[PDB]
Amino acid sequence: HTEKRGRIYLKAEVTDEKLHVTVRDAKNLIPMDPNGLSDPYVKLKLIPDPKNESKQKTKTIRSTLNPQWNESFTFKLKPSDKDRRLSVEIWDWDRTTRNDFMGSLSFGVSELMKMPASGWYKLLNQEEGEYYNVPIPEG
């Protein structure tokens, strides 16, 4: 039972010399809870952030395999963030703690600087998602 058919719609464009991160919704989620569902949240951070102020996070929606957030974040790090990547950590919250790895992905600021990234990203592993950046057009 490892059907990683879940997809996430993540958008990251450069505007006002800042990063416009917009998370739409997710579809085809797989149950990672005893109740037979999954309630993950959207987490994004632009390393290196030792100030802990570039770390953005939203709360989970509810019991559904197709949750929509529609959250829009806009921030940017120092000029030396071009070689850095926007790390998105998608985890399934379990009320008291976390213990379900849904998937992780990242977007390079250097690539995003010359072209905005918007599409459906597949469920990749920690290293797979932080070292790569392959979005699916789906349109």
Binding site: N52, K55, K59, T60, W91, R95, T96, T97, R98
Partner: peptide
């Protein structure tokens, strides 16, 4: 860095 990963609901 604090407990942000496990900081949502009680």
């Amino acid at each position: 860095d604090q407990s942000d990963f496990e900081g949502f609901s009680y």
